[PDB]
């Protein structure tokens, strides 16, 4: 049980990599392989739309915003760490990227499995993500920079 | 099951911080409260005994190496990944250290329990982690830079 999603840059349009999507006994270890990203750290989750395409809000357009929000199965409303049971299970560790642009580490997802993530997104946001919606809504990630679907 | 490790800087003998670890139903989540470190991704293990004194080898000075190896209770005798189990249990995520020197992103180790960690070492390196040995042994972590020992 293993998966390639390809990622694009929002703003370009470009391909920045892939991440490869595996299951074990944990959870699901998430492996990137992509390029072309803003060094530190970027919130990383499941969204639950299939789509990378923009939506609007207000009049404004918001890139990868077809891909709605966080994937939440449960209905909690609320955002939180990837080890915590009452906030999105879309949730996922933050994504680190290297000084030269490079994102390699990879991440493990407790509370997911393989099988429940086909059809939904995976975002990349533009600040980072502290596991909470304070002091900035869905841990301050705010702009989203790269997304793919998960086949 | 809450404990705090003070964290030291094993060149300038200074305090760098604390790491609070705690036990939830995925593993052990190690989070971090440390500043003074080199920004970008850092080796982070446990290791097997419980001091941060130095050792020798072949007449050169290991600072850290009273410590010993990776904590590795199942004698594996190979560094992996925290999420694959024939490599050291002591095997943890990668600690990440910000532009400003700080590192407050928290890590999960599905492996641990908070019970066995009590008397070893958690040690953080100079290098990174890619949870090989191969291009460099234990994850290319090199030079041993801060330690704690978990009481
Ligand atoms: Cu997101
Ligand atoms: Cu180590
Ligand atoms: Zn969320
Ligand atoms: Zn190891």
Not at 6 to 31: A, C, H, R, W
Not at 49 to 73: F, I, M, Q, R, T
Request: glycine share 14%.
């Amino acid at each position: 049980q293993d998966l390639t999603v390809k990622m694009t840059d929002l703003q370009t349009g470009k391909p920045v990599g892939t991440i490869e999507l595996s299951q074990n006994k944990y959870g699901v270890v998430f492996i990137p392989e992509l390029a072309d990203l803003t060094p530190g750290e970027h919130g990383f989750h499941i969204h639950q739309n299939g789509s990378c395409a923009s939506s609007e809000k207000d009049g404004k357009v918001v890139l990868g915003g077809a891909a709605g929000g966080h994937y939440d199965p449960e209905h909690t409303n609320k955002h939180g760490f990837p080890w915590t049971d009452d906030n999105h299970k879309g949730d996922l560790p933050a994504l680190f990227v290297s000084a030269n642009g490079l994102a390699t580490n990879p991440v493990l997802a407790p509370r997911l499995t393989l099988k429940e993530l086909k059809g939904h997104a995976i975002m990349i946001h533009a600040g980072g993500d502290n596991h909470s919606d304070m002091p900035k809504a869905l841990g301050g990630g705010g702009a989203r920079v790269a997304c793919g679907v998960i086949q």
